[PDB]
């Protein structure tokens, strides 16, 4: 943490150990054997079902197989990527994330700054 | 640092960013800067469009382009 931390928080840098997200509700399912990495299919409920992804087997999972998991769920552990937080959640979720994280490093030591300022950077 | 890259004003970009590049690119495109902002104005030496400068820019820009 520290100043090199807030630098990354602002630069929207991709985390070292990203965490996959869900794009739609519905029961999740497996798929083809271990070739290079692995597979993972998305099974929507009513609308079209063309979504899927490849998630390596060398990276453990956390989501439940035969269980409904809404979009933007914790498909794995590790840090989170803000780019993936804008798409599956929205414009308010990502700003609420960056402010809450950047405020922690300053909250550690005796520093206080109204969220307004950081909001202006997020908007830019 | 990636958002400070792309900006309507090319001068403000070439001020801090990679000038040599910014100017080449904004030159082949024939880009046109009307400055509309702070750093550009302090470059050409003009009342910054903010605060005391925003009132002057108000009275000017009102009849300007109208």
């Amino acid at each position: 943490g520290g100043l090199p931390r807030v630098a990354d928080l602002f630069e929207a840098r991709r985390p070292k150990e990203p965490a996959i997200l869900a794009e739609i509700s519905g029961i999740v399912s497996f798929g083809k054997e271990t070739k290079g990495k692995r597979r993972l299919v998305i099974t929507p409920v009513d609308g079209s079902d063309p979504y899927e992804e490849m998630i390596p087997k060398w990276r453990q999972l956390n989501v439940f197989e035969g269980e409904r998991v809404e979009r933007g769920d914790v498909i794995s552990d590790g840090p989170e990527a803000p780019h993936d937080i804008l798409r599956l959640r929205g414009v308010h979720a990502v700003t609420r994330y960056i402010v809450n994280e950047v405020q922690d490093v300053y909250r550690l030591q005796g520093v206080k700054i109204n969220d307004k300022h950081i909001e202006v950077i997020v908007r830019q | 640092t990636k958002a400070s890259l792309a900006t309507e004003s090319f001068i403000s970009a070439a001020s801090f960013q990679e000038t040599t590049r910014v100017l080449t690119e904004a030159a082949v495109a024939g880009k046109r800067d009307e400055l509309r902002g702070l750093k550009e104005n302090v470059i050409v030496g003009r009342l910054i469009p903010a605060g005391t400068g925003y009132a002057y820019h108000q009275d000017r820009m009102r009849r300007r382009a109208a």
């Binding site: - | 302090v42 030496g45 009342l47 910054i48 903010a50 605060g51 005391t52 400068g53």
Partner: protein, 1337 residues
């Protein structure tokens, strides 16, 4: 006690009698240069080592070589003083004899020629350890760089993000190409020449003529695998199976040892020792996974059955077995102990022959250039095998051999096949676990290349650069027709030497504003500069403190700027070994006693023993008192026994530097603040009344005598004549040379400008006719008090707030201080005028200046040169000069004036060297240097005549002193054996020589004296004539300057608000305002307080040294109270001794040596006479006094125990409640006077390129308004402020003028234009292939 002590003693403290004397701290410099010139009859460092290296320079097969005979350093052209006066460098000529030989074809004819040709001069170090590059005393900082030899690094972690951590080695010579040997994450061995591409290391071996069979037979052990008659056997050793896995069944000698599934345990190993097993059979599967070293061809078909480094299959097994092969060689592979590394690399390697290896390397070095046998061969052998292009430097050869666990440290400068194969063996050994990786920051891998060595290296560059023309003219020339001089040049040789001394990130000006600064500067060891590293090139770790710095480099003393950890200071007793490392002294602890012998342990030498700690009870018979003593053995510190003691520290104050040593109570100040105070200590500027430190560490003499600022006595005698100019010392009969007898006639310096514009000057300290031994300060200089370092002053401090006048760190000083001129430091500025030829004729130095007043020209002479002594202020004229300027063409309005009042305009401009505004002083020296030819003016003749007459005066004075001191010896012999006394002194002393003695060796003595006498009288002549010839000689001026008139001003700036002051503990501040004596808080007796600090300034930055310095100083001054009382009451000589004796005592376990045997009354009289102003006290860096000792020193001085008293307010009158810590302290007046910092500007000059206010002229320049300032303005609504900032006050050629013409009309209104910098930007963009433009109104 000595003779310099009987005039004033310094009471010591603590314990631990100092075993090793003070080493001459200016050694490293003087010795390094005492190695660069001292002729050496072998290859040892020095000019000899340079010539022997580059020579002989033989031609291209013409055999017309040119050998090196010897060199000679003729006397310098100018002496140090004259050298500074003229400005030229202080160097000696360097003439070198050369011998050109040829062998014409019977044959065998040998020819030769010899002559000593001049090739540049070399700068000479002074007795103080400094050079004179150009009229400025310059210091060559010693450098610390990576030592040559081998190096085994790790490069772990980040490597391919696997944790498989790799390994690498690096052969770093002293001069040549590096050799890298790294490992590849797939267990491959790669080599790298200097930084180039990567090649499979095996290639280098193929370049050294090593067949594949031999490469295999060089790393892995051959294991016999024979199939004698059948049933594949193995000449296995019981040890090979240690820690291995089984795969078969053993039935050796009928006995079944091991089965399939049970690996070989430690039990089976020794089980093979009782039965004595040397042969065992194996199936056709255990050999199916082995290698074969030597090729195996069929003994019939000639075909190749199996090649070298080839796997084994059951199919090829039958091929070799059917051919008839019985002996099969295998490589002892082991994926745990002995990896297959080399074999695994040989497969990745393309080239399998020697010529192809040479090629691959050539095309690796110079690609795109088709290689050939000759070119590739030459390239290869010229990298690490040619003394001409590669040398390891005995330092490098030593570290290389020692790191490789060799025996003979002395070897050749080039590498050999063993030098490479051994390093690869070591790298692979580390790759197996045994061995280690050297610490990149261990002080055992950091040499110290000081001035004497860098001079030689830069000289060698100038030799090698001329080696070209020598081969050229010696191959494509002729015979005897030319000499060994026609093919040499002084400029190219002396270039790389000049370049080094004149401008280098290691050669700088001497930090001359403090003797401690001069001493601690020449002891600095920077890691930057040539061969070093950049501030952003070195990581954040190479700057940290390593446990090896102990006793070598003070972990405190360093700058706190960007050069943190890269500058450090050489320790007190630290010394350089013979090679290049740092070794510190020690004391051998034999059997459990501590002897007095010394053993300087080097960086790695110490890393193996267990030395004791400097702080330990060694007092007794001499044996280790304590049982379990704390010590450092394996880098780590811990408790060790009483019998495992190897060495002991010389003294506690050997882990610090000269500066950190002067810090009293340093054991009480935190490291941060100690660092600060140590750095600020070398900033204290000398005062007018050099005052001794009331609380020091004794280490003052160790720095006041080292710095040439003092003047010590060479030969012992009695003062024959004291004066503020010279001091004649009549040498002692038992301490003089048996010829001419001489005397010691000293000549002190008077009021010279230091490099920091301050004042340096020496003042006598002994009266007429006084006994003086050797080692006694004959005279004191700047910041020197009778032998001690007088850095600052004694200020009576009292920690208490005062109406916020001190609020943050500001300092509140009494008016009494600024009245007694105890901080009034003197400065000497040097401002010269330069009359030089111009485009409209040469300038004139006449006093006929136009547009001037009669009140100004009244302080000039008939030549317009300020009168010596005449006091002036800023704006006054010192040298009236006018520069010609025609073709003016004034405006018509002015022409009307010229017609009305008839005021014609001069065709000349004005130059007029005028005193800088802000400082006012007195003229103390005026020099005039006129170009040759151009006849001198009046003042020039007057100054040349004063030089002449002053010269003859001083010369004849020295002469008469010696002449009388010699005729006395003449009388001594003319009487003894030939007594004449009355008649002898009757006739003149001229006849004294005409007389003689009867046959006797005494007649020889006379003949000696008359010789020396006349010789002396001849000597004098050449000294006078010479100094005359130089005076009238045409001074050496620049090309195109008529005359130069130097003026030397003498400012006497006082101590006023704005000046910086700090304690020698890390406590800085600025004088807020000098407060009067009345308002100054006083105490019971009625005595005011010098300075009033802030109490809140201790409890944050630990810095507790001031706390106890105040208490000890209060006591040390309380004792002086009684000394002064008994001196004023003139009681008697009894009470004096009665008190002084008991004083130099009290404490616990001290070493001070009671007095009263000192010439009893007369000597204890002068002690008290100089002891009125308190009693000086020492406080070693860690052996200083403690609380209880101070508490008792207070009770002795009729002072409280708590060190606190009551203070009375000067204004109100009531006493400040709540006791107040008062007393004395040593205050430092850093060279940060506000009178030099403050500056201001309204309308000055402007840069030509961009019309911006010139940020130069050192105070007359405008302030800088950077981006951040513009942002701060943008934050507020201020828009016209920002505009007028970057429009009117900087740019806008019209804006400045319009605004100025408006400001005077009472109209405050700007007319913003266009910043000139932006128009210049438009030019620079449009001058390119870019078209930038502007559009509508």
């Amino acid at each position: 006690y000595s003779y310099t002590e009987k005039k004033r003693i310094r009471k010591d403290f603590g314990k631990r009698p100092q075993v090793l004397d003070v080493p001459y701290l200016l050694s490293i410099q003087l010795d390094s240069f005492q190695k660069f010139i001292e002729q050496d009859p072998e290859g040892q460092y020095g000019l000899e080592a340079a010539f022997r290296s580059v020579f002989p320079i033989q031609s291209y097969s013409g055999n017309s070589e040119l050998q090196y005979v010897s060199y000679r350093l003729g006397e310098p052209v100018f002496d140090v003083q004259e050298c500074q006066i003229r400005g030229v460098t202080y160097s000696a000529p360097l003439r070198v004899k050369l011998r050109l030989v040829i062998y014409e074809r019977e044959g065998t004819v040998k020819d030769i020629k010899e002559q000593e040709v001049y090739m540049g001069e070399i700068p000479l170090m002074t007795d103080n350890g400094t050079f004179v590059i150009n009229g400025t005393e310059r210091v060559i900082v010693s450098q610390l760089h990576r030592s040559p030899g081998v190096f085994f690094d790790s490069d772990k972690g980040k490597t391919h993000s696997s944790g498989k951590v790799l390994y690498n080695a690096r052969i770093i010579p002293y001069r040549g190409s590096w050799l890298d040997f790294e490992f590849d994450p797939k267990d491959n061995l790669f080599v790298r020449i200097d930084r180039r591409r990567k090649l499979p290391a095996t290639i280098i071996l193929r370049a050294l003529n090593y067949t594949t069979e031999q490469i295999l037979d060089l790393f892995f052990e051959k294991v016999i695998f024979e199939i004698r008659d059948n049933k594949l056997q193995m000449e296995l050793v019981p040890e090979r199976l240690r820690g291995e896995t089984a795969s078969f069944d053993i039935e050796a000698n009928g006995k079944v040892y091991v089965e399939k599934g049970r690996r070989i345990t430690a039990r089976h190993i020794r089980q093979l020792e009782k039965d004595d097993v040397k042969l065992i059979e194996v199936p056709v599967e255990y050999i199916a996974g082995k290698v074969v070293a030597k090729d195996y061809i069929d003994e019939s078909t000639g075909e190749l059955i199996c090649a070298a480094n080839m796997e084994l299959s059951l199919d090829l097994l039958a091929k070799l077995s059917q051919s008839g092969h019985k002996r099969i060689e295998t490589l002892f592979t082991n994926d745990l102990d002995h990896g297959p590394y080399i074999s695994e690399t040989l497969r990745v390697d393309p080239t399998n022959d020697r010529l192809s290896a040479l090629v691959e390397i050539y095309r690796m070095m110079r690609p795109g250039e088709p290689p050939t046998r000759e070119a590739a061969e030459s390239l290869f052998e010229n990298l690490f095998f040619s003394e001409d292009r590669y040398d390891l430097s005995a330092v490098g050869r030593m570290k290389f051999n020692r790191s490789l666990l060799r025996e003979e440290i002395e070897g050749s400068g080039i590498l050999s096949k063993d030098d490479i194969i051994d390093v690869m063996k070591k790298l692979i050994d580390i790759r197996n676990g045994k061995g280690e990786v050297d610490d990149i920051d261990h002080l055992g891998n950091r040499r110290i290349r000081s001035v004497g060595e860098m001079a030689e290296n830069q000289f060698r560059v100038g030799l090698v650069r001329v080696e070209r023309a020598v081969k050229e003219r010696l191959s494509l020339g002729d015979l005897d027709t030319l000499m060994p001089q026609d093919m040499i040049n002084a400029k190219p040789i002396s270039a790389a030497v000049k370049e080094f001394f004149g401008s280098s990130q290691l050669s700088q000006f001497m930090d001359q504003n403090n003797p401690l600064s001069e001493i601690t500067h020449k002891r600095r060891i920077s890691a930057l500069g040539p061969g070093g590293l950049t501030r952003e090139r070195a990581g954040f770790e190479v700057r940290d403190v390593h446990p090896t710095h102990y006793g070598r480099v003070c972990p405190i003393e360093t700058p706190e700027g960007p050069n943190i950890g890269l500058i450090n200071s050489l320790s007190v007793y630290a010394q350089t070994n013979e090679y290049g490392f740092l070794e510190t002294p020690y004391r051998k602890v034999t059997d459990g006693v501590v002897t007095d012998e010394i053993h300087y342990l080097s960086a790695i030498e110490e890393g193996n023993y267990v030395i004791a700690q400097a702080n330990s009870n060694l007092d007794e018979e001499g044996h280790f008192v304590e049982d379990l003593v704390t010590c450092r053995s394996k880098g780590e510190s811990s408790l060790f026994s009483r019998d495992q003691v190897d060495y002991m520290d010389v003294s506690t104050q050997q882990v610090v530097s000269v500066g950190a040593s002067l810090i009293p109570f340093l054991e009480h100040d935190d490291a941060n603040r100690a660092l600060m105070g140590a750095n600020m200590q070398r900033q204290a500027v000398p005062t007018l009344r050099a005052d001794k430190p009331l609380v020091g560490t004794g280490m003052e003499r160790a720095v006041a005598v080292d710095s040439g600022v003092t003047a010590v006595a060479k030969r012992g005698g009695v003062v024959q004549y004291v004066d503020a100019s010279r001091i004649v010392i009549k040498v002692n009969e038992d301490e003089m040379y048996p010829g001419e007898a001489g005397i010691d006639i000293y000549n002190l310096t008077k009021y010279t400008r230091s490099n920091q514009n301050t004042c340096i000057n020496q003042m006598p300290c002994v009266s007429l006719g006084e006994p003086v031994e050797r080692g006694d300060v004959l005279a004191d200089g700047p910041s020197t008090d009778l032998g001690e370092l007088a850095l600052g002053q004694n200020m009576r401090v009292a920690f208490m707030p005062w109406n916020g006048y001190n609020f943050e760190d500001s300092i509140l000083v009494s008016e009494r201080v600024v009245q007694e001129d105890r901080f009034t430091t003197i400065h000497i500025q040097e401002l010269a005028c330069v009359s030089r030829d111009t485009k409209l004729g040469p300038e004139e130095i006449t006093a006929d200046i136009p547009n001037v007043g009669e009140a100004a020209l009244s302080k000039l002479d008939e030549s317009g040169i300020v009168y010596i002594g005449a006091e002036v202020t800023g704006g006054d004229i010192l040298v009236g000069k006018v520069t010609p300027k025609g073709e003016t063409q004034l405006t018509p309005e002015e022409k009307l004036l010229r017609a009305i009042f008839g005021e014609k305009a001069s065709d000349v401009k004005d130059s007029s060297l005028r005193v800088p505004n802000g400082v006012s002083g007195t003229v103390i020296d005026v020099q005039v240097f006129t170009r040759d030819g151009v006849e001198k003016d009046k003042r020039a003749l007057e100054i040349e005549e004063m030089q002449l007459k002053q010269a003859k005066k001083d010369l004849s004075e020295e002469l008469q002193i010696l002449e009388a001191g010699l005729f006395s010896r003449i009388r001594a012999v003319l009487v003894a054996g030939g007594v004449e006394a009355e008649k002898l002194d009757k006739l003149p002393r001229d006849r004294w020589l005409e007389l003689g003695l009867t046959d006797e060796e005494k007649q020889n003595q006379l003949e000696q004296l008359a010789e020396q006498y006349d010789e002396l009288k001849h000597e004098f002549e050449k000294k006078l004539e010479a100094k005359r010839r130089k005076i009238t000689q045409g001074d050496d001026l620049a090309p195109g300057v008529l005359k130069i008139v130097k003026v030397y001003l003498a400012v006497k700036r006082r101590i006023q608000p704005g000046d910086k002051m700090a304690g020698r503990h890390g406590n800085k501040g600025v004088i807020s305002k000098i407060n009067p004596i009345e308002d100054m808080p006083y105490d019971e007796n009625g005595t005011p307080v010098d300075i009033v600090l802030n109490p809140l300034g201790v409890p944050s930055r630990m810095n507790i040294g001031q706390i106890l310095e105040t208490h000890l100083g209060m006591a040390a001054k309380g004792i002086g109270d009684k000394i002064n009382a008994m001196l004023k009451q003139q009681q008697e000589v009894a009470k004096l001794r009665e008190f002084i004796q008991r004083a130099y005592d009290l404490g616990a376990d001290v070493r001070q040596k009671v007095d009263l045997s000192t010439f009893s009354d007369e000597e204890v009289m002068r002690l008290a006479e100089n002891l009125r102003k308190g009693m000086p006290i020492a406080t070693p860096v860690f052996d200083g006094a403690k609380e209880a000792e101070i508490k008792e020193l207070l009770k002795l001085g009729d002072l409280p125990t708590s060190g606190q008293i009551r203070l009375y307010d000067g204004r109100t009158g009531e006493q400040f409640e709540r006791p107040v810590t008062v007393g004395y302290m040593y205050m430092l007046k850093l060279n940060h006077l506000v009178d030099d910092k403050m500056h201001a500007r309204s309308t000055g000059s402007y840069s030509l390129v961009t019309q911006q206010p010139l940020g130069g002229k050192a105070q007359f320049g405008g302030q800088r308004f950077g981006e951040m300032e513009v942002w701060a303005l943008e934050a507020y609504g201020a828009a016209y402020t920002l505009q007028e900032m970057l429009t009117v006050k900087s740019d806008d050629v019209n804006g400045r003028t319009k605004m100025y013409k408006n400001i005077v009309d009472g109209n405050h209104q700007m007319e913003p234009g266009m910043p000139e910098s932006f128009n210049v930007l438009l030019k620079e963009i449009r001058s390119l292939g870019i078209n930038i433009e502007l559009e509508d109104e």
